[PDB]
């Protein structure tokens, strides 16, 4: 009941926080968690697929923003807080920009919002929100938004 062996190579990356995002199997789990939440939402309360995709896109907003762009530092005390003025997004790949793994993380909030709109017939009750969420996500991940804050709110 076990096949498909993969010989993973260790990328140095010398950072416990953001080195696990290079081993084989991350993208598949990323997507299977989203597809699992979608089914579990419309089972605990029977509803329309469109709304359920909306609740998935709204929950994926808070979790991803609070984790990749709000929190600063690392939860490991071994590095003596060397990364205190950086967020998880900025620590990735030692600051290298537009890599394979950054483009995948940029591309998901867009394609997930397209699905939550194309099955909800646009409208305005949900359109207004989903647009705000995806806009915030895509702006926060811009290359020019590197180590720059907004009016010095959670900046130092």
């Amino acid at each position: 009941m076990a096949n498909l062996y993969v010989k993973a190579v260790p990328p140095p990356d010398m950072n416990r926080n953001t080195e696990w995002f290079m081993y084989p199997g991350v993208w598949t789990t990323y997507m299977l968690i989203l597809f699992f939440g979608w089914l579990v939402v419309l089972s605990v309360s029977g509803c329309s697929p469109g709304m359920a995709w909306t609740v998935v896109n709204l929950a994926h907003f808070v979790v991803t923003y609070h984790s990749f762009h709000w929190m600063k530092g690392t939860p490991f005390a071994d590095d003596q807080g060397i990364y205190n003025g950086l967020t998880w997004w900025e620590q990735m790949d030692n600051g290298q920009q537009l890599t394979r793994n950054r483009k995948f993380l940029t591309l998901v909030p867009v394609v997930l919002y397209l699905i939550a709109s194309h099955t909800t017939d646009y409208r305005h009750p949900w359109l207004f929100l989903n647009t705000l969420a995806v806009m915030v996500l895509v702006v926060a991940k811009f290359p020019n938004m590197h180590k720059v804050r907004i009016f010095g709110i959670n900046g130092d």
Partner: peptide
């Protein structure tokens, strides 16, 4: 008001 977005986002992706 439905296909301008889906047509522009493909361009943005590429």
């Amino acid at each position: 008001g439905h296909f301008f977005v889906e047509g522009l986002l493909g361009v943005v992706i590429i």
